[PDB]
Design a protein around this ligand. Structure first.
Ligand SMILES: Nc1ncnc2c1ncn2[C@@H]1O[C@H](COP(=O)(O)OP(=O)(O)NP(=O)(O)O)[C@@H](O)[C@H]1O
Ligand SMILES: Nc1ncnc2c1ncn2[C@@H]1O[C@H](COP(=O)(O)OP(=O)(O)OP(=O)(O)O)[C@@H](O)[C@H]1O
Ligand SMILES: Nc1ncnc2c1ncn2[C@@H]1O[C@H](COP(=O)(O)OP(=O)(O)O)[C@@H](O)[C@H]1O
Lengths: 67, 686, 257, 890
């Protein structure tokens, strides 16, 4: 459950989550979001980079412990 | 030491002058029952209550003559909670009232017996007197479970009782029975009895939900022999040549001996062997078969024609001897069998036991039929000393002493810890020496076996000392909470507060049930000895190692010391190890000079005998310390040892569980080696 | 509502995977995935049956639960029929002597296999799960398949117990080993790998040139004991009778030696 | 008769007749001992128990029934010989303990009880039971409890024991699991109750068959069967049904004497009296290791080997009566040949001291083997290795190679064990090529990592429904070898199992390592290992291997003492002088090696610096080969830098004086950055002071700045790193950006180190505390290079080599056109560098190893790996690994 938080914290993405049809669907919704923001299909790796940047500027995960 | 410890109390500060001034204290020490008349020794400013007098006398008995402590213990209760408190316990258990009232039909009655005993007789006889039937059932077989189920259902529906024998073989089904019994039982007269053996596999819930009854076999040779004769059917004894009956008596007597010697586990049998009813039945079958084979007809057969060799060999190597592992217990069993089973046993002058109570002897009955032997059994006097079994009379005293400390342990086992843990750890750190270094591993004189052996000893001793000191420092740091506490340290602190030595600390052999305080004291002694060894090696080298009076008890692996000594003697003069045999000479001087082959050993303690001029003699007093033992390795001359020597074992601690080696001691001409064998004379390293 | 659509499209586009088995049929692979999907769908149907908005989709949820229950009840029998069918196919087709020893059971298995192969061709022609479920009398046929296979398996077990009783030393070898022993009776080469399990020191049998008479026995290290009166397999064709004769003659020749 | 047998056994006999002779000698010795003393002690009656106790045989051939012809009587117990053929079995030496065991066992059997020979393991309880069963000619089955137990076979086995009338002995009953033990005890109780009721005094004439309840059915119980339960207590069910017997101390002094007499030795008594205490001393004085075995079985093996050696010496003398041999010399030589290879280097002087103590004045001379010791020299010279004889540099390693050859000849299933950094792989590689050059038989070695693949991939899997068997790596290799479609027979095939050993992946390997040489696959197929195939276990510690696998394999122990530092230095210098880092480059390498030769001596600067760096504190455990290899790589980079400078200056190239200064300064710089290059600043400073104290090469004259902060320039002078630190001005919008790398002292020093260690493609791990910029520095250095493509893998706590495999599938491709399958990046000319942060974080399994770490080790050391798709060895090119991880103490 942990060390997946650490990677998205140090970089902003977890590369192991997206593969195959999941990666293709993520690519599709990424290009749709690019159209919404005014961008285009461009490159698939570039769309993944756009997804990563949007995650690092938008996502804020909050996680709680007891001392 | 006991007086020194007791004088720490303010009421006993003048104990030393009190004991010196009194002159009847010496005769009081040797009295049969010191607890009856304890001299007024404690110093008190005001007269004390009788309970206080009992407490002070109990303390004195713990100091002087601890063996009577249990007896004194009884007196204390009688002086506090009233006389005849345990008197009902001595009276035979009248459990008919217990099964009538005070026991609900819901609560089962469990009858737990010591292994080798049966409890169904009492309940069966009470059923006979209370004219209520019981469906007695054995739970050995698979059909036994369903049979018990239908029987208990029928009896709870009608109002009868049920029996379930040897239920310790079905623990899970016992739990199921407890769950089933937890339901309401409509009838009130229904009673469920669980005859059973004391075994830890059984459920705790059943024990909690039922009334437990502990049954023991009564101690005494007479009681054991009567039980054996009652167990054997009469027809077996009164059949074939009449001598059979006598033989059975002999067997019975023998059995009783090797059972009653079991209660004295360290002195008399080394370990706690089973020697149960199965061995007795096998011996009975062997005697029956061999008597039938030798004497075809019913006519009486001459005592010399009895196959004595067959019985002796079969009951020394197949029955009663299969479970015997070490050589010396086998030798003792052979001595017993040869003493009893011989053609002399059929004479009127045969002595089953000699030296009993100093001069009295157990004369063998002059009988031919079973009834006379049974009558002789019933006429045995109650004053049965351990001298009947061949043990010295003081063994009983020793046994009582053991029970005494066990009792204390139980009181300790059944009785804010940071402060006391700190003070104990600090005291131990002040007690345990700081550090010894590996001043070893010299290229020159590596060939000396003692050098290598002491290198290994010093290495592993310093290693384990560093480990113990590190753990103790960790405990010190945590008791103030100056650092965190880990799982290993949690286990260590729990084991320390419970008073059991840590498992991570015991890297060498240890007596069972040893307290941490005694363990660390022996640690300090061993570290002092190893530091002396290192100092001698540094000062003189490898030569000085030979001329050291090393104690075997302190050394962690004494057999390795003996091996290294053998190698050292073999290397000098260029001998091979097979040709070196060990010779022990007891020297009075603690620092007597050693020749090229003698090595000094101190701390050896002889039990049951005293040595003078390398000659042994039997004595009542135990733990006769040997002044100095010279171990010599001489070239074997290939001769047969004379009949005036004994091969005494050398155990390491008082619990005779591990054997180090054997010593050939010459005995005085008056005694015989058989008496040495039966009395359990031995040498202890500690 | 959307989850119902997801379930509908999942089970309307689901296809049964088929893998070839010895160029005989195309058998179903992916039992674990299908079972997990069915169990998850059933649990979710029961879960949203508990929902407050369930009254709107009550009839659709009930119909879909009925469909899922039918699918589960079919496939839990289909997997058992599969495992049994491959087991009996392996044992009745890997040997040639199995026909003689159990002829009526072999005929029953031939019938059950013909029916199963017809069903397998039918499902192969339409691998969709809804099409498979809609085929006429699939559950009844599966029940008959399973019960006949269970009965023939019990008969096979009884026959193996009878063979064990006839020759006690067969109790040491396993069920598979004993099956290979009886099935490969004609070729003694496959028998010699089991002789080290039944007998004590015997590791092979020295036979005639045509493997007709058992000339003697041979231990593991090559020591040979020659029977004084050789036992003929051609006269006692049954494996148990001539094996018992071998053991008895071995004891007799040992005594004579 | 004994004299005739002893004369005959000395000659040459076929092995079967040899075994018959030894059995006859043992039985005749026992008979002589019985008659000489136990019967000649004034005994004159045939009914005296001194004679009835001995195992008597009575033959009545007139009886028609075969089972009734021979009667075996002992004490009052009578049995009929079962006449079950036993082949040729090992006969036990009848020690007095064995006689007592026989007496008690037949006494128990007569009373229809069972036998419980309890005692410590290794006293021969199961062997004694088997010998008793074979004496009466009964089939005996031994149910080993070493987790090879089950209900389904055990129930029917009990039914068979009841039916046919065989014997059943349990090797160690106490080791069974509690429920297993209880159920087996229930079945044993049923069987033994049936046996007990079979001899009812009122029902002695058994009219109705004696029956018992097993497998939920009635089973007839034959009167001749029995159950023996060997222990190490008995269950409460069986306490009243079994007779116990203590077998604690077997009489080794008599076993050794009897076997040495059977082997032909004429002084067996003295040799036994020497060799039993000697093995006791070997067990006690010597250090404790898992693989040592000084029990009775080892003594028996040593004695039979000594007999073989004496017979071979007799044959050699004859081809060139003969009873003047030094039998003690033969015994000690056999002991050495059997025990020295599996001894640690520390214990060898201890073993020889014990041998001198017990065998005084008897010396051991090893075999010369000058025929192969010359091919070893040639192969070592051709591999740029170091070879030496005896006390010379190389004696220990060559002796280890000779011992490996000896154990290879003796048996298959070798096990080379030694701490990481010893000459293990090189030893067997050199042995293989030397054998191929000597005998003319081509040697082929298959290197397999058992942990790189799962057990299913290693051995094959069966389809759960399709019932189709697909073979794994080892199974496919064995099948390919046995099929000989190419001619792998007549070629020495060595399946070396590089890696560690755990009781999981070797479960099917016990059946082939032992004398069976048979691999049993789950599908039913059986494979026989051909005689020209040896399976080697190249392991490191042998701490998580069961005794069953260890005892089945001959062993050679490779201590770190074997591979001395001079060996490593000589090999490095030879490779520098011979192998180019790519002729002018070779000339530069030779000049550099000539310059640094004085420092790479026995007591040179490098050795002293190493002995110092060992005492320091390092974040990871120091290994001699790790620092030595990093140093060698950095010197290779120094030579490359010299070549590059010469290329940049076509006129006036590097001169001898300037090259000498540059090489001496670079050597100190490389010692500083290789030894203690993974430590704190204080440790680096301490090592700098120490090397300053010893060395004579010029050092930076500044007494304030530690030398570690300095560097060596191409001109041959010490220059500060601070002068090479540039001043950068990042854009305002890019302050504290994820990718901005402001240069600093660390950023440039580690940059130079990274370039140096990536020139040789050596994988490296940037271990440092969290937040130190390890990944940032690594990415900057990697992406600064134009021909390097970087892929970042975050190793999670559940990371498996499947993540790696997916990585090469996504980024690389398989190409068949070379000699073997090649895994190469899709981009041409681009060296794919696999980034692995948190490389140590993946979890160790139950047996103290990491799966992905072992995969990386295999793919780095060998250059490739086996793919499970078709079980073939793909070779990696244009692929590097770079790692990063937090300190292990975290
Ligand atoms: N030379 C440098 N140039 C630029 N930024 C640097 C430099 N050294 C350190 N930093 C910064 O220091 C921080 C180091 O964090 P980071 O780059 O994530 O290293 P890290 O190895 O991933 N830490 P961790 O993975 O948890 O062990 C980042 O904010 C870097 O930008
Ligand atoms: N004479 C020599 N014999 C053996 N190795 C030598 C010799 N001279 C130098 N060496 C070096 O010693 C090393 C031997 O390593 P080897 O392959 O034997 O290790 P390994 O035990 O298989 O590895 P690991 O440490 O992973 O277990 C090599 O670096 C080799 O170059
Ligand atoms: N009396 C004996 N004479 C000769 N060899 C013996 C004797 N007892 C044991 N051995 C040897 O000891 C070895 C191991 O004994 P084993 O039966 O495995 O011990 P355990 O009973 O603990 O399993 C056997 O190979 C056997 O040859």
């Amino acid at each position: 459950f942990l060390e997946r938080m650490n990677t998205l914290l140090a970089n902003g993405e977890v590369p192991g989550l997206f593969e195959g049809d999941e990666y293709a669907t993520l690519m599709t919704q990424c290009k749709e979001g690019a159209q919404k923001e005014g961008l285009m299909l461009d490159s698939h790796e570039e769309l993944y980079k756009w997804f990563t940047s949007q995650v690092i500027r938008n996502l804020h995960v909050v996680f709680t412990m007891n001392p | 030491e006991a007086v020194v410890r007791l004088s720490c109390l303010p009421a006993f500060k003048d104990l030393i002058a009190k004991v010196q001034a009194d002159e009847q204290f010496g005769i009081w020490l040797d009295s049969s029952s010191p607890e009856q008349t304890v001299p007024y020794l404690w110093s008190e400013e005001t007269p004390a209550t009788p309970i206080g007098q009992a407490i002070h006398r109990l303390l004195l008995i713990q100091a002087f003559r601890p063996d009577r402590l249990l007896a004194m213990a009884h007196m204390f209760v009688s002086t506090n909670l009233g006389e005849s408190f345990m008197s009902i316990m001595e009276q035979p258990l009248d459990l008919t009232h217990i099964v009538g009232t005070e026991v609900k039909p819901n609560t089962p009655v469990l009858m737990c017996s010591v292994p080798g005993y049966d409890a169904s007789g009492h309940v069966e006889d009470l059923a006979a007197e209370q004219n209520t039937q019981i469906t007695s059932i054995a739970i050995g077989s698979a059909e036994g479970f369903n049979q018990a189920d239908k029987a208990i259902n029928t009896a709870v529906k009608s109002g009868r009782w049920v029996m379930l024998k040897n239920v310790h073989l079905a623990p899970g089904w016992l739990m199921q029975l407890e769950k089933k019994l937890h339901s309401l039982q409509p009838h009130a007269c229904f009673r469920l009895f669980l005859t059973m053996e004391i075994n830890p596999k059984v459920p705790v819930n059943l024990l909690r939900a039922g009334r437990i009854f502990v049954f023991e076999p009564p101690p005494g040779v007479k009681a054991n022999m009567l039980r054996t004769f009652s167990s054997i059917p009469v027809s077996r004894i009164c059949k074939s040549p009449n001598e059979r009956a006598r033989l059975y008596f002999l067997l019975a007597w023998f059995h009783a001996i090797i059972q009653e010697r079991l209660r004295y586990a360290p002195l008399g049998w080394s370990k706690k062997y089973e020697f149960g009813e199965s061995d007795l039945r096998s011996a009975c079958d062997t005697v029956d078969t061999w008597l039938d084979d030798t004497a075809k007809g019913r006519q009486n057969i001459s005592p010399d024609k009895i196959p004595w060799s067959a019985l002796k060999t079969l009951m020394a190597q197949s029955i009663y001897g299969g479970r015997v592992d070490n050589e010396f217990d086998q030798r003792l069993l052979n001595t017993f069998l040869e003493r009893l089973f011989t053609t002399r046993s059929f004479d009127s002058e045969f002595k089953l036991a000699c030296k009993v109570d100093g001069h009295k002897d157990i004369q063998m009955p002059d009988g031919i039929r079973r009834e006379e032997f049974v009558q002789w059994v019933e006429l045995l006097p109650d004053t049965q000393t351990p001298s009947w079994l061949g043990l010295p009379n003081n063994a009983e005293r020793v046994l009582l002493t053991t029970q005494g400390v066990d009792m204390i342990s139980k009181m300790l086992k059944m009785q804010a810890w940071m402060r006391t843990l700190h003070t104990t750890a600090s005291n131990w750190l002040h007690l345990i020496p700081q550090t010894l270094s590996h001043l070893k591993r010299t290229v020159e004189n590596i060939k000396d076996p003692l050098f290598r052996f002491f290198e290994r000893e010093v290495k592993m001793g310093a290693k384990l000392l560093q480990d113990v000191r590190q753990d103790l420092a960790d405990v010190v740091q945590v008791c103030e909470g100056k650092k965190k506490q880990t799982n290993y340290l949690r286990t260590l602190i729990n084991e320390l507060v419970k008073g059991i030595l840590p498992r991570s600390w015991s890297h060498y052999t240890v007596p069972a049930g040893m307290t941490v305080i005694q363990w660390v004291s022996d640690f300090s002694e061993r570290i002092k000895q190893l530091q002396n060894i290192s100092l001698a090696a540094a000062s003189g080298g490898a030569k000085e190692l030979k001329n050291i009076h090393v104690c075997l008890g302190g050394l962690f692996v004494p057999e390795a010391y003996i091996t290294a000594t053998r190698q050292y003697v073999a290397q000098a003069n260029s001998w091979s190890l097979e040709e070196l045999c060990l010779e022990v000479n007891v020297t009075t001087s603690q620092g007597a000079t050693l020749d090229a082959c003698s090595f000094g050993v101190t701390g050896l303690k002889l039990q049951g005998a005293t040595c003078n001029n390398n000659k042994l003699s039997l004595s009542n007093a135990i733990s006769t310390a040997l002044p100095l033992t010279q171990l010599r390795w001489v070239k074997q001359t290939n001769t047969e040892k004379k009949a005036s020597v004994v091969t005494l074992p050398v155990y390491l601690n008082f619990t005779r569980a591990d054997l180090i080696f054997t010593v050939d001691f010459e005995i005085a001409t008056k005694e015989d080696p058989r008496s040495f064998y039966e009395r359990g004379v031995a040498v202890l390293c500690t | 509502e959307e989850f119902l659509k997801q379930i509908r499209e999942v089970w309307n586009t689901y296809e049964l995977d088929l893998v070839n088995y010895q160029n005989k049929c195309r058998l179903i692979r992916g039992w674990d995935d299908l079972f997990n999907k069915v169990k998850e769908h059933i649990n979710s149907v029961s879960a949203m049956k508990l929902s407050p908005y369930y009254k709107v989709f009550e009839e659709d949820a009930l119909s879909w639960e009925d469909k899922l229950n039918r699918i589960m009840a079919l496939f839990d029998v289909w997997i058992d029929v599969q495992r049994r069918w491959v087991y009996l196919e392996g044992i009745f087709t890997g040997s040639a002597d199995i026909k003689h020893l159990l002829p009526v059971e072999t005929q029953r298995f031939q019938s059950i296999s013909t029916e199963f192969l017809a069903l397998m061709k039918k499902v192969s022609k339409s691998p969709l799960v809804m099409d498979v479920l809609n085929i006429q009398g699939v559950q009844r046929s599966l029940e008959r398949l399973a019960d006949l296979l269970g009965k023939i398996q019990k008969a096979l077990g009884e026959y193996l117990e009878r063979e064990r009783s006839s020759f006690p030393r067969f109790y040491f070898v396993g069920d598979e080993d004993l099956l290979e022993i009886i099935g490969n009776s004609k070729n003694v080469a496959k028998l010699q790998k089991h002789f080290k399990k039944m007998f004590a020191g015997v590791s092979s049998i020295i036979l005639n040139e045509d493997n007709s008479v058992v000339l003697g026995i041979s231990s593991r290290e090559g020591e040979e004991v020659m029977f004084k009166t050789p036992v003929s397999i051609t006269e006692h064709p049954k494996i148990n009778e001539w094996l018992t004769l071998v053991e008895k003659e071995m004891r007799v020749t040992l005594a004579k030696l | 008769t004994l004299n005739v047998l002893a004369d005959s056994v000395l000659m040459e006999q076929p092995p079967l007749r040899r075994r018959k002779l030894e059995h006859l000698i043992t039985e005749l010795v026992h008979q002589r001992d019985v008659t000489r003393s136990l019967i000649k002690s004034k005994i004159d009656n045939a009914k005296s128990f001194e004679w009835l106790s001995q195992m008597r045989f009575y033959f009545d051939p007139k009886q028609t029934d075969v089972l009734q012809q021979l009667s075996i009587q002992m004490a009052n117990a009578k049995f009929n010989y079962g006449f079950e053929y036993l082949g040729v079995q090992d006969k036990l030496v009848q020690t007095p303990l064995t006689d007592r065991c026989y007496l008690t066992m037949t006494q128990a059997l007569e009373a229809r009880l069972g036998g419980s020979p309890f005692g410590p393991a290794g006293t021969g309880k199961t062997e004694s039971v088997k010998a008793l069963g074979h004496q009466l000619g009964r089939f005996v089955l031994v149910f080993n409890c070493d987790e090879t137990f089950d209900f389904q076979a055990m129930g029917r086995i009990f039914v068979g024991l009841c039916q046919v009338g065989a014997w059943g002995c349990f090797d160690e009953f106490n080791r069974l699991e509690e429920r297993m033990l209880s159920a087996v005890s229930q079945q044993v109780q049923c069987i033994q109750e049936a046996l007990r009721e079979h001899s009812n005094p009122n029902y002695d004439k058994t009219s109705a068959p004696i029956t018992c309840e097993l497998l939920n059915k009635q089973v007839k119980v034959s009167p001749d069967m029995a159950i023996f339960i060997t222990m190490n207590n008995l269950p409460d069910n069986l306490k009243k049904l079994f007779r116990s017997l203590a077998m604690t101390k077997p009489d080794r002094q008599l076993i050794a004497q009897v076997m040495l007499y059977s082997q032909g030795f004429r002084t067996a008594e003295v040799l036994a009296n020497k060799i039993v205490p000697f093995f006791k001393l070997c067990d006690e004085q010597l250090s404790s290791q898992s693989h040592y075995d000084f029990g009775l079985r080892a003594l028996k093996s040593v004695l039979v080997s000594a007999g073989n050696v004496k017979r071979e010496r007799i044959q050699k003398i004859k081809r060139e009566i003969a009873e003047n041999l030094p039998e003690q010399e033969i015994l000690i030589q056999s002991v050495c040949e059997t025990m020295v290879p599996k001894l640690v280097a520390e214990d060898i002087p201890l073993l020889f001291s014990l041998l001198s103590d017990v065998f005084p004045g008897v010396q051991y001379h090893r075999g010369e083997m000058t025929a192969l010791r010359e091919e070893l020299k040639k192969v070592c010279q051709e591999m740029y290795l170091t070879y030496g004889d005896g006390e010379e540099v190389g004696g220990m390693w060559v002796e280890k190679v000779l011992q490996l050859y000896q154990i290879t000849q003796i048996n298959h299933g070798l096990m080379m064990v030694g701490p990481s950094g010893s000459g293990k792989s090189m030893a067997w590689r050199v042995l293989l090529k030397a054998l191929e050059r000597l005998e003319g038989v081509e040697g082929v070695a298959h290197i397999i990592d058992p942990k790189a693949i799962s057990k299913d991939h290693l051995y094959g899997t069966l389809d759960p429904n399709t019932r189709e068997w697909t073979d794994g790596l080892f199974t496919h290799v064995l099948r390919k070898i046995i099929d000989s479609v190419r001619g792998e027979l007549q070629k020495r095939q060595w399946i070396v199992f590089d890696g560690d050993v755990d009781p999981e992946w070797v479960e099917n390997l016990n059946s082939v390592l032992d004398d069976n040489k048979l691999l049993t696959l789950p599908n039913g197929e059986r494979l026989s290992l051909p005689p020209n195939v040896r399976i080697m276990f190249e392991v490191q510690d042998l701490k998580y291997a069961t005794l069953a696998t260890v005892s089945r394999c001959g062993m050679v122990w490779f201590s770190e003492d074997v591979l001395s530092t001079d060996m490593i230095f000589n090999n490095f210098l030879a490779r520098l002088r011979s192998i180019p880092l790519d002729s002018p480059m070779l000339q530069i390498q030779r000049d550099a090696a000539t310059i640094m030769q004085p420092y790479f001596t026995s007591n040179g600067l490098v050795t002293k610096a190493l002995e110092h760096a060992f005492q320091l504190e390092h974040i990871m455990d120091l290994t001699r080969l790790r620092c030595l290899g990093s140093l060698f790589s950095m010197l290779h980079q120094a030579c490359r830098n010299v070549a590059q400078y010469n290329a940049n200056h076509p006129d006036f190239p590097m001169q001898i004086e300037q090259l000498e200064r540059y090489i001496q300064r670079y050597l100190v710089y490389a010692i500083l950055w290789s030894l203690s290059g993974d430590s704190r600043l204080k440790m680096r400073a301490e090592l700098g002071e120490y090397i300053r104290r010893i060395t004579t090469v010029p050092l930076p004259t500044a007494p304030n700045i530690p030398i570690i902060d300095y560097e060596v320039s191409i001109s041959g002078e010490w220059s500060p790193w601070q002068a090479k630190v540039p001043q950068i001005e990042v854009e305002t919008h890019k302050v504290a950006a994820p990718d901005v790398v402001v240069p600093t002292l660390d950023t440039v020093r580690h940059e130079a180190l990274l370039y140096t260690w990536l020139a040789e493609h050596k994988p490296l791990v940037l271990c440092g505390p969290p937040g130190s910029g390890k990944t940032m520095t690594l990415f900057s250095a990697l992406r600064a290079l134009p021909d390097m493509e970087v892929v970042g893998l975050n190793f999670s706590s559940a990371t498996t080599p499947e993540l790696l495999l997916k990585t090469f599938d996504h980024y690389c491709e398989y190409r068949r056109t070379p000699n073997g399958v090649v895994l190469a990046p899709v981009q041409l000319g681009k060296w794919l560098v696999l980034f692995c942060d948190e490389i140590n974080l993946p979890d160790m399994d139950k047996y103290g190893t990491q799966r992905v770490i072992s995969f990386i080790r295999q793919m780095v050391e060998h250059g490739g790996f086996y793919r499970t798709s078709d079980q073939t060895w793909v070779k990696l090119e244009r692929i590097q690994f770079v790692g990063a991880c937090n300190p292990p103490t975290d």
